[PDB]
Amino acid sequence: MTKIKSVRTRVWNWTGPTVPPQGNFCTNASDALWIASFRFHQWLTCEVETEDGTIGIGNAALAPNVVKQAIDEWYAPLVIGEDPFDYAYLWEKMYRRTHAWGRKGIGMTAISAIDIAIWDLMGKLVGKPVFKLLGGRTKEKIPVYYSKLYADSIPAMQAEAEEAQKHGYQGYKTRFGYGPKDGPAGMRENLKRVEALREVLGYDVDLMLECYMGWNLDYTKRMLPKLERFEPRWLEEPVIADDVAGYAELNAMGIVPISGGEHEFSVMGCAELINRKAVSVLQYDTNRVGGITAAQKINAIAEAAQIIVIPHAGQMHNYHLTMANMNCPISEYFPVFDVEVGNELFYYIFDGDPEAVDGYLQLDDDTPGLGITISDAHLKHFEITE
Amino acid sequence: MTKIKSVRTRVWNWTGPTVPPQGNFCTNASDALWIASFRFHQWLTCEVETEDGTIGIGNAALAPNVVKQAIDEWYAPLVIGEDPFDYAYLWEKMYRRTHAWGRKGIGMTAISAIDIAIWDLMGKLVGKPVFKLLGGRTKEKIPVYYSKLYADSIPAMQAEAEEAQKHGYQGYKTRFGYGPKDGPAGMRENLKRVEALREVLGYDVDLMLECYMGWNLDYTKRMLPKLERFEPRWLEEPVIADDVAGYAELNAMGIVPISGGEHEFSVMGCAELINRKAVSVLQYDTNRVGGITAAQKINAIAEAAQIIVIPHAGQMHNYHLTMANMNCPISEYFPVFDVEVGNELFYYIFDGDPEAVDGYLQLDDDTPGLGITISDAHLKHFEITE
Amino acid sequence: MTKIKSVRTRVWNWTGPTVPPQGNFCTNASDALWIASFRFHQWLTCEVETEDGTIGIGNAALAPNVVKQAIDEWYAPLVIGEDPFDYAYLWEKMYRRTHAWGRKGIGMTAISAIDIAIWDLMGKLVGKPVFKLLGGRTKEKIPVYYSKLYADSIPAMQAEAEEAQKHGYQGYKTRFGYGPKDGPAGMRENLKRVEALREVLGYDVDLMLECYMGWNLDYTKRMLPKLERFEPRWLEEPVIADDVAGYAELNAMGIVPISGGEHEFSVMGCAELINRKAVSVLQYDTNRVGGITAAQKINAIAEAAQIIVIPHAGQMHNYHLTMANMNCPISEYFPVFDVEVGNELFYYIFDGDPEAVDGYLQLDDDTPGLGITISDAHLKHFEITE
Amino acid sequence: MTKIKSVRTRVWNWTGPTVPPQGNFCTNASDALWIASFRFHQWLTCEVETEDGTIGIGNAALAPNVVKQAIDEWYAPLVIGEDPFDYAYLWEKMYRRTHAWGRKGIGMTAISAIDIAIWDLMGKLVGKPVFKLLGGRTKEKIPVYYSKLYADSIPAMQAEAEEAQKHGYQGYKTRFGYGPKDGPAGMRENLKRVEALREVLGYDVDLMLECYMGWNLDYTKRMLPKLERFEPRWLEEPVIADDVAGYAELNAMGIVPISGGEHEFSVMGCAELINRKAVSVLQYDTNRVGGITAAQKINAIAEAAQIIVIPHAGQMHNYHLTMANMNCPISEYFPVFDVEVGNELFYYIFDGDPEAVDGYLQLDDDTPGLGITISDAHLKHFEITE
């Protein structure tokens, strides 16, 4: 065994071309304020190197500068000098030593970046793809749903839908543009948009609706009966992440399946969502929830409950987990587009993330680790701090 | 990757010296009959070999001849030609293809033997101990509890206890000799025995009480208040395995923690015991419950619920799992004794299972796989069929 | 009283003509694998003979070779030398002596074959039909539902329906051909098929929908609202048998009654499905669940809960139980067809199973025992091992 | 098959010697009145004869004259001309045709007498003891508890206890003499009596406490903590039969197991007590609850719940059921004493009821039917009306 030598954490600030939303607008938790700032224009890379020179690559997107401070000051020192294959111990070490403040949020996100790197490292050390160490190939290939379709003018939304359709996706997710603050008029605008998409896409494909924590219990309860006729596959994050009780009440109404979890942290955090039937579809993001070590355990819990898992974001740190579990049927897919909201920013930082072909993704059976590398292609578009 | 070439299953029938219980007697499910036949005098070895010649070793103890028929006829054909690292897929393949009849019992036991072998195989293929692939070292060493101390005359029991004490164990399990059929008099005999052990061992060590499915809801509910003063760490399998509701009711009384699970099968099977709080200590045996693939998932579920896991039996197929999870604090330890009940029979078939030192067990950080081999030492004491 | 002298167990392997599905396809638990193998091409007969020469006939279909090994090695020895009329004791003897591994699956199936034979034996010994010993005639005759109608081209399905209609059935069951893996498109194909059957059959007959464990909680929850307009009488086995919690959640949605139980074992096993309201229609098969002794007790439990019982499969081992209980209104009827899936294989092995007349079945008030005999008619089509 | 020809119902009024309680006194539902009338000084015999001359013997003790009117006017006409072996149909016929008023009480008691006779009849018709038709011998012999020991002076109670002890009983039941109306002083008198019995009997035998519906929820809740130190095996009928909720609340306190059911009627009636965990020991009397047909079904339900069944009263109509079920461990035994309260009156009417030997009862393996006959021995002590 070769021990961990160092942890290199860098924050990448996008300084390249940005595209004006051209009339875009999406709901979010801040809408309640009478003040969705495109959060992902920064990203964090975490490289864990062993004494033998092997390097594992991890990442995180939430508040990169704050997370970097946590990793450099508190977490990195906890894994230096340790065997990567004692990953469960290292995870617990970080989890308990900082439990007072790292339980959720910054801390768990920091743990996530380091843990993902440790898994990439393990795969490389034994020459196996990460998904093989997690269980192997449970699917021929991974079906994916087209993730985007922000609220806009009806013509604009229908044009995007028609374009997306040409690529074979069997699922499409769309984001609402109006919420509680927009009152009754906003409800109609929301419904008009879903109808417009069914007009183009038809009813024989999955249509997912996303609120991004922009609604509340009151508003959602009244919108559910109105959304039923469009037969959505699910309604995502209708309430803020702290309103777990609201999630459970909404999911129990049994009108439209409720999904969520991208803003939930730790194994016990997601176990509660599963056990309380707060969601019918769990969507944690491995680079937030605690890493692959935590996600693998969460997948076991969700599988026993038969609440399907479809991680938030389409990246290797999520794909390998999905490939290895029967209860993880499909993945979310952000197409390789220009930098707008930021979900696609990782494509400019890394090379190796699979691109969809006729609505499916594939993983190489041999490529060791996660199958990604940090790219030099866009260094010109980034101001990287270390 | 090297593919699975064959599956060699053998049933070992002990024909060597047997020791007369000298007055032993233990409760069991059959006591209710007005008719504990020492079940383990047979054992099954399952060797899974890949094209490159590497061999993984698995095993099972329940109804070996029946399990062998299942493996040779139904399960073996399902893994031949497959990559061992697609273990989650292979597990699901066996689980679903035979779900109609293999869900629990024979089928799941057969799956267990094959899956354990596949993990030993994986460890050997990448040159890593199984526990490293499962999470690594979460404990300096593994504390173990002395498992035996069958009911006998008071003098005989106290003598065994005094001998066991000299070896540093911090926990001791004893089996009851009387049950419902023995009526009120039997209750006193049971209590006299527990008191006699506390007399020797004292109250500063763990004392576990085992019923081996020999009691029932009625009798246990009345015995609990009577056992309380002896402060047992737990009461094991007070009712038959099908009485899950009874388990939950007894555990909810909150007098003595109830343990069980050695006769439960599959991930969903144990998940139910956890979710229904049927037990406070889960004791599945990896060579029955579905193998390491299933046990790893069960450990994740139990850990989130904080219901500790202490697998039934002290063998490598259980030790590696325990080593890798924080919620698996100690192991059950059958000392290397003469063949009596059969729990120790595996010591004669395999070489490599750790022996306790001052009440602790250790695993080698380098030894690939499970760290065991099939021994030639006792071939003279076995009639092996293939 | 005459004691049990021997237990003769034989496995019948069909070697005769087989018919190509001509485009058939049905959902099943294995569909999840990216690999419904017509399981019943083998069958087991179990003859229990008493010292006086009287012979009782029992049977089983699940994994015959494995079940035969269990009967010959573990169960048969437990009933030899016993009075058939101590059936409850013999059942408990087999149940407890092998509880560790026989609780469900192979063991309980083996117990089933022996117990059914013991009842046929008892009826013959006292010269009474089995149903008379169980309670007598609660129905003038037994209404039955046509069981088949596998997924196929619309024209093929409608042709079968039209043919079935001519025989007076008031109920028809159909099997789905698409599941979770077929995504949104498969959902439409499923709905198109149910609609096509209502087109032919109309809405004034019962239409039962079968999934055969081929769907999951996620998919079923989304299909229920879509199936509602076809007013199905029930939805059968939407999830795998281990997902009892899923069964209960689906049944609680109250959209379509959920049925299941053909893959559940023992009295306590079915009692749990009843008590947890996991199903609204219980469908254990007497030659799997534990035999007539167990089924009679299960019928008592189900009756008190008013959850109707309609055993899986139309054979005498089920008909006699149904005839004797008011809560058992109808039976499933596999027509005497060519050997395809195997459900009809018993017609070639035994003689005596009633054939439907205008959608009803009848039992003879005098014929002792089950009213069946092992036939010599098709010995030419079987390779029988003993 | 021979059809039922007639139903002969007779009420036996005891006119022989009666013994003055010599200072006896026992609690009962009427104590609340500021007004336990020894109810059983009358008894009912019900003989069901078939065309071939065979006669089955049934009985009932509750309000004989009222029950006789019901049998002669409503029930008898429903079974005449029917095959005894259609017993489940005949039971349902009586149950449904009179459901409006016979559900519980008089009606169900009448059904009980007829049904018991039908079973005795069936056993005789096929030459088998009733218990053989019900499942056979599950016990070597039947342990019984001494049932009596009414409240009296301490010396009188201790003398009875000492006498009872000489006969090998492992269980003894005693009846309280004070209740709510006797206030705080009565509580002490009750406790003094239980203590006095433990003084003689010791703590290594079962001690059952009976209230006979003479207490209430309020009083019992306060008495439970006070009775705990005497370790009673159970507390019988602490509240009136209509207070099922009270039963459940008391049983849930988990201080002393609560028993009851002798005043509950029908299968669904007892199923509710079982399902609501109203009792930990079910004590229906077969000649009240609905007969052997109903009791057999109740035993199945109780067994699955593992709530033991110990029928009220020691008579053949209860013994045969107990013998055939594993969940029916012991029987209540009224010794053959002089006519005082009336529980022993059946010994003077019938011949064949087993007498205890060293605390156990036995049933003959050959004797057809219930093994009883109506005796001519005490015709001189009865005024029989027909």
Added chain:
Amino acid sequence: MTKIKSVRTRVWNWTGPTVPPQGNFCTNASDALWIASFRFHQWLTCEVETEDGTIGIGNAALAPNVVKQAIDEWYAPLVIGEDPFDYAYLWEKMYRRTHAWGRKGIGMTAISAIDIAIWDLMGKLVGKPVFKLLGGRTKEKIPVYYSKLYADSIPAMQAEAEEAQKHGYQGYKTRFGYGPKDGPAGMRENLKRVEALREVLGYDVDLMLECYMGWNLDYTKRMLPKLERFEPRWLEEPVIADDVAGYAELNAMGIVPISGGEHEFSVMGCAELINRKAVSVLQYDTNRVGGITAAQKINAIAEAAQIIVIPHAGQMHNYHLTMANMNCPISEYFPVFDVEVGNELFYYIFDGDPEAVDGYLQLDDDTPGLGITISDAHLKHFEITE
């Protein structure tokens, strides 16, 4: 105070003209038998006379001959010599002294007849109408629903409806003619009948549907969604009275309010239906449930729960209770028709029961007691036994 002198109980057997149903047919509990016998062709009058000569009139309809035996032998002796104004004590005296067998059914019905008489007696003794002693006038007049409309040919049913409409009723109840035994075809026949009535009556009047215990849980659950579009005010007694759990499950589906209670007995009996939300409309009949003393207490319990009470049957023993409680909005009204089913038989025995005027009933503010007398008008049509 004047004490009760005697209790005169008589059974009136109708021997006058009877009308042939002309094609009528209604569901009932006995339909399950492969055998609704117009039960009420007998009736019981119970006259309680005090020493001063005042006479109170009570009655009962269930099994009159059996009830008469109970009153004469057990109950009458309990009230003789007592003050009528100690009615609560007398009720408890009868309730407790016979609790073992009178809890429900015959006993409680007997208590009902005596108690109703005692109230009529009290009203006469103080010169006040019964409803005044119970609370007074809570309603200007009592709205009533037309109770009848048995299943028949569509033309016959529509003709009755048109005739009933001319009398101003705002509510109409109809009885189903098909049940579980009639299968799918019967379901259509049932729906056709409800539709036919809505055709005539329209949707602006209450339409109540009655099953009279002729359906079961299974069938009702499937019929509810089908009945919803006819907007029935309630579905009455869909299951047998012992299936309280079924009542609660059906009522909880929230499709159509479930009513019941006419076959429930005692205060605690109805309190359970209320507390378990088994019904949304409670319909006990005062001459069955325990009398006015019990009904007054039941009305208090139901009122607090806001579960409306609409007693079964339109007679003074029910009207006075309804008049005095705000939670008792309307009454069931059997028109004064020829003797067919028997519900109208009381009109021939008594004089004083109010007749509907434009769909309303009125009570006299002065008339003492119940305001009824036993009539001599139809003595010629009765064979009265005493």
